[PDB]
């Protein structure tokens, strides 16, 4: 008779996504117990803005989004409203309006390999900043100077994204941190997502 929103798929997925192509999962028609989230001792950051996770086990929202991706430790600061840097501006931007939670944890035992795990990637350039909750998976060669490169890389013309070098001996912060971001939707629409208490 179970019918809970599947947060087990979001947090316990064996492989995650690179931040430039961050995975979004929707939450609809279900009842989710949020006490499983905050009360499991494997989270290094659980910043909630404008909402408390211990106090919405009552209210029903229109729908909940769970964005999940993988960055490095020093970049978890950028997953916040009003931040700047290569991740907040070119990879995953949060609005200043943000109401939700950015949950993150150290994953050096899953997303590391001896010779480096280059499977996670981040965007270095684009000609403009990301709108909030925008996902740009473009691979167009970034034109850095006056020279226009018609699809061929060369001088002042680089590939727009590079890959992390996650080797397990790197100091903390050059280590992979998995991140899950919960955004909340509710006002003038049927609500199908809430909790028990």
């Amino acid at each position, epitope marked *: 008779i179970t019918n809970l929103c599947p947060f087990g798929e979001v947090f316990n997925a064996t492989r995650f996504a690179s931040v430039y192509a961050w995975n979004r999962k929707r939450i609809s028609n279900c009842v989710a117990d949020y006490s499983v989230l905050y009360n499991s001792a494997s989270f*290094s950051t659980f*910043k*909630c803005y404008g909402v*408390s996770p211990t*106090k919405l086990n009552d209210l029903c929202f229109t729908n909940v989004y769970a964005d999940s991706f993988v960055i490095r430790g020093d970049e978890v600061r950028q997953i916040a409203p009003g931040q700047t840097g290569k991740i907040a501006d070119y990879n995953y931007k949060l609005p200043d309006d943000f109401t939700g939670c950015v949950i993150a944890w150290n994953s050096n035992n899953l997303d590391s390999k001896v010779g480096g795990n280059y499977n996670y990637l981040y965007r270095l350039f684009r000609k403009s900043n990301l709108k909030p909750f925008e996902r740009d998976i473009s691979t167009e060669i970034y034109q850095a100077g006056s020279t226009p490169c018609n699809g061929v890389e060369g001088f002042n013309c680089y590939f727009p994204l590079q890959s992390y070098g996650f080797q397990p001996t790197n100091g903390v912060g050059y280590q992979p941190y998995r991140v899950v971001v919960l955004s909340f939707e509710l*006002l003038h629409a049927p609500a199908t997502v809430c909790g028990p208490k």
Partner: antibody, heavy 120, light 114 residues
Framework: TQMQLVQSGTEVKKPGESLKISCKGS????????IGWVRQMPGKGLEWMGI????????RYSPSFQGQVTISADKSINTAYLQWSSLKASDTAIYYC????????????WGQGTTVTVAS | DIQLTQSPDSLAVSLGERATINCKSS????????????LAWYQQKPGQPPKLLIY???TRESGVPDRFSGSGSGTDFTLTISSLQAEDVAVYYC?????????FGQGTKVEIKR
């Protein structure tokens, strides 16, 4: 009980002395809580001093308290600190620590407060 | 940032009757993205820590009797004590939390009229 906060004992100081009082959270899920510090002067109302997230030690002060005191946090032991460099007699009050799981959220967990009196 | 003012300062209501405490802000504290007012009501008795009674203008915290009710929106808010009782003699503060710095009201003292 989800979370309860326990504060430093009552401290009787003299002017000019340093002072650092504590507030310790016992329970699971402390990573969510944003510890704040409220001051209540004898026979007056409550004044909000500042708030701190121990995960990053990101702290915001209120304009009437920035620079005058500092708000530390030791994440490894679920403790948030409040410290004076040199106590003035204007600091004699009760100091409550208050917690809420998030920023711009209600303060739903309160400590017993530490009275601090600074005179002979 | 937002400053709050509540009224009356003191209030005397006889047992079983209704007590009303208004609280006005200098700025509206209404997130339109969720449509909730980010205002809270606290109770504090002498020698005791403050107690959160009502958050989001109209939502009661656990351990709070249903005799307590707050409502209103935008700029003016009110916490109503339905059927006042002796254990309610206390000071009641209204606090905002729309933006930091958080601020309280100056406090309202409720007492029993005999």
């Amino acid at each position: 009980t989800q979370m309860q906060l326990v504060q430093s004992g009552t401290e009787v100081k003299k002017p000019g002395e340093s002072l650092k009082i504590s507030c310790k959270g016992s329970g699971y899920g402390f990573i969510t809580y944003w510890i704040g510090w409220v001051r209540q002067m004898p026979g007056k109302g409550l004044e909000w001093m500042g708030i701190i997230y121990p995960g990053d030690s990101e702290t915001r002060y209120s304009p009437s308290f920035q620079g005058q005191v500092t708000i530390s946090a030791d994440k490894s032991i679920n403790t948030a600190y409040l410290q004076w460099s040199s106590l003035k007699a204007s600091d004699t009050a009760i100091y409550y620590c208050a917690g809420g799981s998030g920023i711009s959220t209600p303060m739903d967990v309160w400590g017993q407060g530490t009275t601090v009196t600074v005179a002979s | 940032d937002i400053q709050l003012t509540q009224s009356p300062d003191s209030l005397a209501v006889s047992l079983g009757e209704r007590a009303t405490i208004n609280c006005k802000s200098s700025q509206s504290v209404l997130y339109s993205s969720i449509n909730k007012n980010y205002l809270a009501w606290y109770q504090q008795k002498p020698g005791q820590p403050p107690k959160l009674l009502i958050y989001w203008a109209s939502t009661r915290e656990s351990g709070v009797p249903d005799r307590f009710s707050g409502s209103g929106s935008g700029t003016d808010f009110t916490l109503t004590i339905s059927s006042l009782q002796a254990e309610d003699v206390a000071v009641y503060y209204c606090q905002q939390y729309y933006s930091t710095p958080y601020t309280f009201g100056q406090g309202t003292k409720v007492e029993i009229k005999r």
